[PDB]
UniProtKB/Swiss-Prot annotation:
GO terms for cellular component: cell surface; cytoplasm; cytosol; dendrite; endoplasmic reticulum; external side of plasma membrane; extracellular exosome; extrinsic component of membrane. This is Major prion protein. Belongs to the prion family. It is found in: Cell membrane; Golgi apparatus. It is linked to PrP is found in high quantity in the brain of humans and animals infected with neurodegenerative diseases known as transmissible spongiform encephalopathies or prion diseases, like: Creutzfeldt-Jakob disease (CJD), fatal familial insomnia (FFI), Gerstmann-Straussler disease (GSD), Huntington disease-like type 1 (HDL1) and kuru in humans; scrapie in sheep and goat; bovine spongiform encephalopathy (BSE) in cattle; transmissible mink encephalopathy (TME); chronic wasting disease (CWD) of mule deer and elk; feline spongiform encephalopathy (FSE) in cats and exotic ungulate encephalopathy (EUE) in nyala and greater kudu. Monomer and homodimer. Has a tendency to aggregate into amyloid fibrils containing a cross-beta spine, formed by a steric zipper of superposed beta-strands. Soluble oligomers may represent an intermediate stage on the path to fibril formation. Copper binding may promote oligomerization. Interacts with GRB2, APP, ERI3/PRNPIP and SYN1. Mislocalized cytosolically exposed PrP interacts with MGRN1; this interaction alters MGRN1 subcellular location and causes lysosomal enlargement. Interacts with KIAA1191. Interacts with ADGRG6. GO terms for biological process: cellular response to amyloid-beta; cellular response to copper ion; cellular response to xenobiotic stimulus; dendritic spine maintenance; intracellular copper ion homeostasis; intracellular signal transduction; learning or memory; long-term memory. Its main location: membrane.
Length: 104
């Protein structure tokens, strides 16, 4: 990892995709899927899009590299479903820190 941290735990979003089968498929198969995302503190770096692109590229990776040793099943369809959720949790998470910093 180096300097990444985890955020703070919450629910996961419910995300429709063009059929509620894909939403429900994901929601019934959350479990493995991350709930908090990994990202870094400012140190000048602050972004929305490039915190989120990072988080969707670090959280996902540190859920594939580990996965390659436990015989897991994450197809591209699973990775896409994961990224979709990780994005939204990350955007949501970034709003908790954004409001919390702006409120200080």
């Amino acid at each position: 990892l180096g300097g990444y941290m985890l955020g703070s735990a919450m629910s996961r979003p419910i995300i429709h995709f063009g059929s509620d089968y894909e939403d429900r498929y994901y929601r019934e198969n959350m479990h493995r899927y991350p709930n908090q995302v990994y990202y870094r503190p400012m140190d000048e770096y602050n972004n929305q899009n490039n915190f989120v692109h990072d988080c969707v590229n670090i959280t996902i990776k540190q859920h594939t590299v580990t996965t390659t040793t436990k015989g897991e099943n994450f197809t591209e369809t699973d990775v896409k479903m994961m990224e979709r959720v990780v994005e939204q949790m990350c955007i949501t998470q970034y709003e908790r820190e954004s409001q919390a910093y702006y409120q200080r």
